[PDB]
Amino acid sequence: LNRLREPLLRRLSELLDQAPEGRGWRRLAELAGSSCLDLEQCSLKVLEPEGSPSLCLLKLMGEKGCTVTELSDFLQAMEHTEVLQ
Amino acid sequence: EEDLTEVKKDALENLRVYLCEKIIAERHFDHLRAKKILSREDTEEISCRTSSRKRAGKLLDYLQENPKGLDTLVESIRREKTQNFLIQKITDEVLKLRNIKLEHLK
């Protein structure tokens, strides 16, 4: 999450931004179990020409202290295996 | 960049019908009048209208001359925190039209 380098996070964010899926980034922010300011500041971070909501959400979950295998478990729960590959 | 400008323009003007109902017309043009994008002549032209809705119409259509106006339209709504649920709606609209532009790039 917050520990890793620039290209992995950048590519994962710029791939998660282009989400034609109905289970998009707002779905990925809404996980199972574990207020408004997170969603509002990500949705205002998208207004810049070079931003993603995905970057804001990955920074948020890195501030959560999530780990890469933990997030991969959440992504398997997200049940789009195209993201995991 | 002007690509953001054009997608911002059509991303506003595609959705004129919904926004011209749930917006009080008078309660904003002191904030955006401080941004030096709107004048007293606009205030008199808006007050020339008699209907509720057409005020919102000509006011909403009187912002398509500068790209940065929509932010100010957010900002007063950000300022007076009475209603705020329109934000992620128009935001998701911008993400959608941005996605079509992005797929049209390659």
Side-chain angles (χ1 to χ4, degrees):
Chain A
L1 267 295
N2 51 4
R3 294 292 182 185
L4 56 92
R5 292 184 181 180
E6 287 84 4
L8 192 147
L9 188 145
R10 186 70 177 172
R11 182 173 294 276
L12 198 279
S13 64
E14 72 196 1
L15 264 292
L16 204 152
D17 194 1
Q18 46 184 354
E21 59 188 2
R23 292 184 179 94
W25 67 275
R26 181 168 172 82
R27 171 63 180 170
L28 199 147
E30 194 268 327
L31 291 173
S34 66
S35 297
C36 297
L37 77 160
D38 292 332
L39 305 178
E40 289 183 354
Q41 291 301 318
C42 296
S43 299
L44 292 175
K45 277 296 297 295
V46 75
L47 289 178
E48 69 189 0
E50 296 294 325
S52 69
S54 305
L55 174 62
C56 178
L57 182 54
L58 288 174
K59 287 185 180 180
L60 183 65
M61 296 181 71
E63 290 175 353
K64 290 290 288 185
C66 182
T67 316
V68 178
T69 61
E70 180 183 1
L71 178 57
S72 295
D73 292 332
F74 286 111
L75 290 172
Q76 183 61 40
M78 191 270 294
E79 73 190 2
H80 285 279
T81 62
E82 185 176 0
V83 178
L84 280 81
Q85 56 90 30
Chain B
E1 190 186 1
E2 294 181 353
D3 57 355
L4 268 296
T5 299
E6 185 178 2
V7 71
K8 195 68 69 177
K9 181 176 180 180
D10 320 334
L12 187 271
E13 285 289 326
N14 58 0
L15 206 140
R16 180 182 293 176
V17 176
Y18 174 70
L19 295 172
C20 291
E21 184 176 0
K22 293 179 179 179
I23 292 173
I24 179 169
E26 196 272 333
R27 295 176 64 186
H28 295 284
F29 45 85
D30 295 330
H31 171 265
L32 60 149
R33 196 177 182 184
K35 296 289 185 181
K36 299 179 182 179
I37 47 95
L38 191 145
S39 176
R40 187 180 297 275
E41 289 81 2
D42 289 328
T43 301
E44 188 122 0
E45 195 54 36
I46 286 293
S47 295
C48 286
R49 300 300 303 164
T50 65
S51 174
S52 297
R53 188 176 299 170
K54 280 82 176 177
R55 297 172 191 173
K58 187 167 66 62
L59 177 61
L60 188 272
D61 292 335
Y62 230 85
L63 187 140
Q64 301 303 107
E65 66 184 1
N66 297 115
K68 63 184 73 174
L70 281 82
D71 193 4
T72 63
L73 182 60
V74 174
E75 176 62 31
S76 67
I77 294 173
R78 178 63 65 192
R79 180 176 179 270
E80 291 183 354
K81 52 176 74 174
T82 303
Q83 60 185 0
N84 53 3
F85 50 85
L86 304 175
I87 295 299
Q88 196 169 5
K89 178 175 173 64
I90 58 97
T91 300
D92 198 2
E93 191 272 333
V94 171
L95 269 84
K96 186 180 265 78
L97 222 292
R98 183 181 178 91
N99 196 1
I100 274 92
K101 178 62 69 178
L102 188 148
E103 188 171 359
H104 187 75
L105 176 63
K106 291 184 182 293

